[PDB]
Amino acid sequence: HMFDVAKYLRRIGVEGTPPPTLDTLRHLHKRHLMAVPYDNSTAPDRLPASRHLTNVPLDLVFGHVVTEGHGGVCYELNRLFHTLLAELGYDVRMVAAAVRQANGTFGPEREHTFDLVHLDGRTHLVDVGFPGPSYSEPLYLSEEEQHQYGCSYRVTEHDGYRVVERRPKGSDWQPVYRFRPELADPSGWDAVRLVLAGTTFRSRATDNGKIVLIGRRYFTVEDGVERTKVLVKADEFQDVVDLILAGA
């Protein structure tokens, strides 16, 4: 009952109650990724003993992300965004995906959680909860090449999966994640199941790209041009954390 559309829209820098159109969806998606960073720093603290996402009240996640201004992980940010989109009138369907790993395999089948929106006879992929380099505006569910912010995307079909692939400037196509579109479900969020500190993941979009910090590995993409640096200095590291977490 604490979920509040207006409070959320203010949190992401969106004015009024914009109309339920594709132009609005594209704006909401980009603004969310600019304003609400991905952060797994305290994700373990919000896990339920039961392993069922339903047992984590939506208001707890809303309070952490929206009221308090923090970031979150895929099943927090996309869960909130699904609810916002539904309250703004969109036909939103939850989907789970397997993420491409550094070694080229795909990880567990339902590790990543995101959404699809069916609008005006076309289906769009919606994902404001993915740590690494990926799309700032929704993709169409199509193998046709799509272009945004200096990168290309396509959603190909391979062996019963749809595969989101990305190509920045000067690089080859690489998969991001894969999913089974036919398992999309309007109510799918209800079915989700969940020493040095573990590796921290933090990122957010910028006006023309994205900034990503994975451990010490700092990545930026600006109009499709990528740069990476392994951070050594503690002060520089903290400056990058602060820049990500401050939003835009």
Numbering used by the authors: 0 to 193, 204 to 257
Share the article's original sentences:
To our surprise, we could not find electron density for the different thioester groups in any of these structures, but we found densities for the cleaved SNAC or pantetheine groups, instead. The bound SNAC and pantetheine co-substrates show conserved binding positions within the active site aligned with the β-strands of domains II and III. Two stabilizing interactions of the sulfur atom in the thioesters are observed with Tyr37 and His111. This flexibility reflects the predominantly hydrophobic nature of the interactions with aliphatic and aromatic residues in the active site (Val72, Tyr74, Val98, Phe129, Pro130, and Phe210), and is consistent with mostly hydrophobic amino acids surrounding the catalytic triad in known NATs25. The SNAC (Kd = 1.16 mM) and pantetheine (Kd = 1.32 mM) prosthetic arms exerted comparable binding strengths in the low millimolar range.
The overall folding of GdmF largely resembles the common architecture of its NAT analog, revealing a three-domain architecture with an N-terminal α-helical bundle (domain I, residues 1–88), a β-barrel (domain II, residues 89–185), and a C-terminal α/β-lid (domain III, residues 211–257), the latter being connected to domain II via an interdomain region (residues 186–210).
